[PDB]
Ligand binder design. Structure first.
Ligand SMILES: Nc1nc2c(ncn2[C@@H]2O[C@H](COP(=O)(O)OP(=O)(O)OP(=O)(O)O)[C@@H](O)[C@H]2O)c(=O)[nH]1
Ligand SMILES: Nc1nc2c(ncn2[C@@H]2O[C@H](COP(=O)(O)OP(=O)(O)O)[C@@H](O)[C@H]2O)c(=O)[nH]1
Ligand SMILES: Nc1nc2c(ncn2[C@@H]2O[C@H](COP(=O)(O)OP(=O)(O)O)[C@@H](O)[C@H]2O)c(=O)[nH]1
Ligand SMILES: [Mg+2]
Lengths: 431, 434, 98, 42, 429
């Protein structure tokens, strides 16, 4: 009908989706063992989007978890919803990559790309009309940044028409855990521009900023961080699973978010995050969602969008709201701020409404926006990648994998050409 | 006998048709299962008797996204609607006229054609095709255009009324809407007999100002559109002094074959507390039908000149008051008419007052009027759309989508020039030979 | 601790399961097949969806009139009566094209 | 009727918060660092 | 509709606002939890002016409490009406200014202004039709005297048309607890004259005299001082929040109070100030209220109007009353004290009536007045500021902050220019 195969790459990817799948099963009333105890007929009306049918009233994951290290996956199949997955979709090798992008992309990845291609083909042919796939991974590791790129490039050839999302975790300069980070990141975004329909730039340091200030959590783990990206990407396909006053899907946003094929990077954000001192002194309303969202402190990317221009803005609202108050706010932000919006695109805003409120909440909103501030990330990464590469530091690890040197040069060049043309769209006269 | 077939397309089409059919069942007294066991004709133009005494609507709800239709199939009127009539696809166009016209529509064109063929076989003398859609959505634009193109050659003569959501000038539910709106105007130009463009922003202003609903949803608009179409069809469904069918208000509204865009206006639309202190009369409602605030489309008729105006009075109306009100309107420099239409009012009269649906907002009233004005002040809307579409297309934004779906890029400029010529025709009409 | 706000399950806060045994394929076949015993009003006390609040006011019971349920829908019904000759020609042209 | 329903929803939210605070108290009273395994010589 | 956002800066500002926010909560029947417990309908009809709606019948103040030292906010949060304020409205730095105007205005204030600007823009946008802002602060401190001038300077550029009232606290020459008080005072009034619609000069020495002789309190603390000022600040806007026979609001007085933009300093008075022995010998009448107003002893400013000329006078009366005396009481006081009123403006008195009386009292009154004797305090400050500045004493503290020394001269020149033309309006034919 309209099905999604959830591709999973790396320790980042496995932990992100495990929290994500914990959320969705609660959204559809599924126990840790797999059945449906709920009383919502509309929870089962569209459960085949993410799950597959099994005997005995059981519903199974349509996920393929991938890693290069055995240690991560028992952590998945021992957790809150460990047993809901099936052992065959669990695919993983014996030797890690050591944060080396080349190893997972060329040397060790090639032995495992076959088996993951096998299982995803069966999840593809299991569904009648597959809408498109979906991957969560990190640009800072060896498998998600590495193998994850090799997976996408193959299934683009196999399934060209199908949409392809990616919630790629981009590294932060303020907080980085990897010396060899810039080499992997520069060699992966070159794969992302060519073969991806849709990308969301999630940055961990931003999640550390949002928890310290708005949430005032004393000791945040990565589990709180995983819950943020799960609620965001629950808010992207919420209109797909449930009916609404004005419906949409991923493809409805996809055509409406891409003026030109080189630009598919966006800045997700969540509306209703308040601390526990803020719950008592609040009155939930459509304006208060727009006030919390448009605050650039709230964004989960790593750049301030006042330094650029909004190309296109999406707002997927969830709950029961009056639409006059919905559209009047979207017009109101365009009129007041007369400098942050592109002029050659009037009515920059796409808005969708899903009637079913979010889990555990009465009102919410989700946002996908294309700005010029995304180029602030790359040029800062290019500031570090060139500093690595001018002295050929850490190069023998990648050179010994069998690649040449011009692949680095074309990577930055294509990366430099992207931000160069991206800068032009900021400074462009409409008339 | 007189019959109308509903060809609702899109999410807007399905919701609007649900509103219309709820209201229709309410006035005609058909139970939600489809019976009228009160223990004639009237319903015959809309419903159709079955073998075991059940009444079937003559509508083909069509949509390219399933959930919109599945809600209807699980709603209250599931037994009321024949399941084959509701036609669904597995993917939508996703706001893309090219997908709705070239890649996706052609799969279901044959099926919807067979269904409407069955309905037209069931009818014996058919009056009209009421076709409802939106200019924004990819399905309700492209597939609607293709069904117009095939329907015109299948039934060459039959009248095809068109109710269409025109994109609002300021608020918008889409960014890629102007391209579809421009590319659909070609089909609504050469394959329509009358158009009834409806604007959500203007309905919002009217409802907030008059009905005191500070926070409405789509249903509040849908009730008003249902009241409009019911007012149109009341002369055909209920006894009246001056009945008016589809052909007559088709004929006395269209000056030239390229000008089939009149504007609807409904009066009175006031809340029940607003009505408790108002005397309501023919003069009052017919003067409210001329106010620019009550115009259903965001355009100002004082900037233009009317060429035609069709009145549909309903309720305990008296033609003495109708003609007195018409004389009062005529004795006014406030209303301009072109030099080549000294007479421009088309009266139709029906006895039965409009019914009222609980959960609605309008109050029960003994009299009402509908206004269908063909005026030339509507050119500025296409002018704004021209400015927006040109400053869209100058940098070739979003064009790669439609090109990949498979429509040639020259058609964009073709449709732009076509609607520019339509605007110039409107200007030539507005020119007076004085 | 993002959501230690009260959980407040929506549909739980506010039949066909017996028909289709909580099976998705059986429910799809059912909703294609009608065969649903219960209704939105018949289960849920407050209207959840848009067309549910659209069609919340009614009764499924065949022997009901909203007319007798609440008296303000009472409206004089000046309906045309299709004359016997009119019916003759109508049915005649329906079954026999000549 | 609408405002009555919203008021009762607000009361339900308060009751849920009270219940979760009480179970917070109970799991505060509980005490363990076993992690499903004590050290093998303990 | 017509909303006000209460700005709040400094320890004097924090304590005066907490007393103020309690007073109007008592007026409008709001419990320390924050719900509504009052009885009359009129007690909850215009609550939106000062309170913002929160779920579950909850009302929250539209305040922005700011202080450079975190210690004061704990006292605000520990007060009886402490928990009502939202925590996100509390904006505070880690280091204070140390009674230095320069540190508050330039070096330390620049880090904190944007946070306050964020909250101010957040609260101003929430109201659909904002009447104007309102700030209480002290000129003898470091933050309210300092960055408090900085936040005024910005919002005039951002929001030009909105009204700006300052119940500012001016230092006393007789009673002073701050050595560098004239330095911050001289560098703050120059900020006021450029950007302020109206000012109410508050002198803590004058209230100390009032509690000594009028109320005859043995041990007056700052709360009683705060109680008097809060009563005055309530009486300004009582006609806005409640209907009256002759209504008014902030712009009604301000348009009618000041003839030129350079003169926006007022002299505020409260009528019903009687000791407990005075209650048993009194008859509550309007003439008694008028008699208690025009006496300079009742006045809470640091000047005697008998030495100057009253430019314009405002009287706002509160409670059920018959207004025949009101027109004649102002007429009688106009004719008798003719020399104390300027001749180029007859009918110097502006009057308004608010129907709803204050809680715990039957009749109340407030007086706003622009008088020529307001120059007595500025020239007194000129005596002390120039005395310190000739020898360049205590200057390296301000000098180390990066400012120049021409700012002191221009600030001194501006207030000399202010009093000079203000002196000119005294002797006008
Ligand atoms: N007045 C009114 N307009 C509606 C309603 N529902 C949808 N619309 C309009 O429909 C437009 C979008 O198209 P949809 O009807 O949602 O979907 P579609 O026409 O099938 O096109 P696709 O989504 O691409 O399949 C929006 O711009 C709305 O203005 C409705 O209930 N009332
Ligand atoms: N936000 C977040 N980041 C994570 C989480 N787990 C891992 N990461 C990030 O992932 C990076 C390590 O990824 P890695 O395991 O080497 O990826 P792999 O090589 O594809 O398996 C670190 O920089 C972390 O910042 C998580 O639960 N939340
Ligand atoms: N009348 C009155 N004056 C006060 C109060 N609190 C402080 N003050 C005065 O304010 C002065 C100190 O101001 P300060 O706290 O340094 O202001 P800040 O630097 O902005 O915080 C002292 O001289 C006090 O006389 C109060 O509650 N009432
Ligand atoms: Mg659609």
């Amino acid at each position: 009908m309209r099905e999604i195969v959830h591709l999973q790459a790396g320790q980042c990817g496995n932990q992100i989706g495990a929290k994500f799948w914990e959320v969705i099963s609660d959204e559809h009333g599924i126990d840790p063992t797999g059945t449906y105890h709920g009383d919502s007929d509309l929870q089962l009306e569209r459960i085949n989007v993410y799950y597959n049918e099994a005997t005995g009233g059981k519903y199974v994951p349509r996920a393929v978890l991938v890693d290069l290290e055995p240690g991560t996956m028992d952590s998945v199949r021992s957790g809150p919803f460990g047993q809901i997955f099936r052992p065959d979709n669990f695919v993983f090798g014996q030797s890690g990559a050591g944060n080396n992008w080349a190893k997972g992309h060329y040397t060790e990845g090639a032995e495992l790309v076959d088996s993951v291609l096998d299982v995803v083909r069966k999840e593809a042919e299991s569904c009648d009309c597959l809408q498109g796939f979906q991957l969560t991974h990190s640009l800072g590791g060896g498998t998600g940044s590495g193998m994850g790129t090799l997976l996408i490039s193959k299934i683009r050839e196999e399934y060209p028409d199908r949409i392809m999302n990616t919630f790629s975790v981009v590294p932060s300069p303020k907080v980085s855990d990897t010396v060899v980070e810039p080499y992997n990141a520069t060699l992966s975004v070159h794969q992302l521009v060519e073969n991806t329909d849709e990308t969301y730039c999630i940055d961990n340091e931003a999640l550390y900023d949002i928890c310290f200030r708005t949430l005032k959590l004393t000791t945040p783990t990565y589990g709180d961080l995983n819950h943020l990206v799960s609620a965001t990407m629950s808010g992207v396909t919420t209109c797909l699973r449930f009916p609404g006053q004005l419906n949409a899907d991923l493809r409805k946003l996809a055509v409406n978010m891409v003026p030109f094929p080189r630009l598919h990077f966006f800045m997700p954000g969540f509306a209703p995050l308040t601390s526990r001192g803020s719950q008592q002194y609040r009155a939930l309303t459509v304006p208060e969602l727009t006030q919390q969202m448009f605050d650039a402190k709230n964004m989960m990317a790593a750049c301030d969008p006042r330094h650029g221009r909004y190309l296109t803005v999406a707002a997927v609202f969830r709950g029961r709201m009056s639409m006059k108050e919905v559209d009047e706010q979207m017009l109101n932000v365009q009129n007041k701020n007369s400098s942050y919006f592109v002029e050659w695109i009037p009515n920059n805003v796409k808005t969708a409404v899903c009637d079913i409120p979010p889990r555990g909440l009465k009102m919410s909103a989700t946002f996908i926006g294309n700005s010029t501030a995304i180029q602030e990330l790359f040029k800062r990464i290019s500031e570090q990648f060139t500093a690595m590469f001018r002295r050929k530091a850490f190069l023998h690890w990648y050179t010994g994998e069998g690649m040449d040197e011009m692949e680095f040069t074309e990577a930055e060049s294509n990366m430099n050409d992207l931000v160069s043309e991206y800068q032009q769209y900021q400074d462009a006269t409409a008339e | 006998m007189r019959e109308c077939i509903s060809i609702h397309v899109g999410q807007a089409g399905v919701q609007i048709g649900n509103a219309c059919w709820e209201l229709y069942c309410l006035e005609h007294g058909i139970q939600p299962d489809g019976q009228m066991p009160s223990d004639d004709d009237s319903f015959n133009t809309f419903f159709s008797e079955t073998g075991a005494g059940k009444h079937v609507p003559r509508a083909v709800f069509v949509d390219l996204e399933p959930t919109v239709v599945d809600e209807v199939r699980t709603g209250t009127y599931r037994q009321l609607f024949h399941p084959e009539q509701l036609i669904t696809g597995k993917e939508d166009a996703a706001n893309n006229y090219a997908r709705g016209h070239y890649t996706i529509g052609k799969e279901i064109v044959d099926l919807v054609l067979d269904r409407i063929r069955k309905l037209a076989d069931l009818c014996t003398g058919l009056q009209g095709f009421l076709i409802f859609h939106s200019f924004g959505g990819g399905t309700g634009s492209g597939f609607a255009s293709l069904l117009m193109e095939r329907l015109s050659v299948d039934y060459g003569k039959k009248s095809k009324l068109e109710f269409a959501i025109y994109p609002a000038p300021q608020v918008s539910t889409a960014v890629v809407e102007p391209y579809n709106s421009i590319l659909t105007t070609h089909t609504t130009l050469e394959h329509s007999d009358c158009a009834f463009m409806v604007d959500n922003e203007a309905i919002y202003d009217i409802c907030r100002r008059n009905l005191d609903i500070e926070r409405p949803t789509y249903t509040n608009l849908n009730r008003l559109i249902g009241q409009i179409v019911s007012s149109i069809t009341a002369s055909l469904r209920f006894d009246g002094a001056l009945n008016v069918d589809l052909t007559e208000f088709q004929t006395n509204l269209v000056p030239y074959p390229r000008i089939h865009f009149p504007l609807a206006t409904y009066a009175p639309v006031i809340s029940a507390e607003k009505a408790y202190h108002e005397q309501l009369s023919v003069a009052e409602i017919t003067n409210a039908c001329f106010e620019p605030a009550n115009q259903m489309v965001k355009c100002d008729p004082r900037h233009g000149k009317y060429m035609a105006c069709c009145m549909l009075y309903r309720g305990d109306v008296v033609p003495k008051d109708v003609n007195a009100a018409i004389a009062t309107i005529k004795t006014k420099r406030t209303i301009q008419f072109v030099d080549w239409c000294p007479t421009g009012f088309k009266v139709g009269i029906n006895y039965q007052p409009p019914t009222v649906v609980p959960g609605g907002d309008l109050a029960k009233v003994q009299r009402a009027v509908c206004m269908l004005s063909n005026t030339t002040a509507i050119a500025e809307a296409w002018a704004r759309l021209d400015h927006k579409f040109d400053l869209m297309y100058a940098k070739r934004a979003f064009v790669h989508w439609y090109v990949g779906e498979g429509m040639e890029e020259g058609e964009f400029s073709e449709a732009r020039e076509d609607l520019a010529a339509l605007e110039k025709d409107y200007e030539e009409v507005g020119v007076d030979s004085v | 601790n993002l959501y230690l706000l009260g959980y407040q399950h929506y549909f739980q806060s506010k039949g066909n399961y017996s028909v289709h045994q909580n099976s998705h394929e059986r429910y799809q076949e059912a909703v294609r097949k009608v065969l649903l015993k219960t209704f939105p009003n018949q289960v849920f006390r407050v209207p959840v969806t848009d067309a549910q609040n659209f069609s919340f006011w009614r009764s499924n019971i065949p022997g009901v009139r909203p007319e007798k349920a609440i008296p303000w829908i009472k409206t004089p019904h000046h309906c045309l009566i299709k004359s016997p000759m009119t019916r003759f020609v109508d049915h005649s042209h329906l079954n026999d094209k000549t | 009727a609408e405002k009555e329903e919203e008021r009762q929803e607000f009361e339900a939210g308060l009751a849920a918060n009270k219940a979760c605070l009480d179970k917070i108290q109970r799991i505060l009273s509980e005490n363990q660092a076993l992690s499903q395994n004590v050290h093998p010589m303990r």
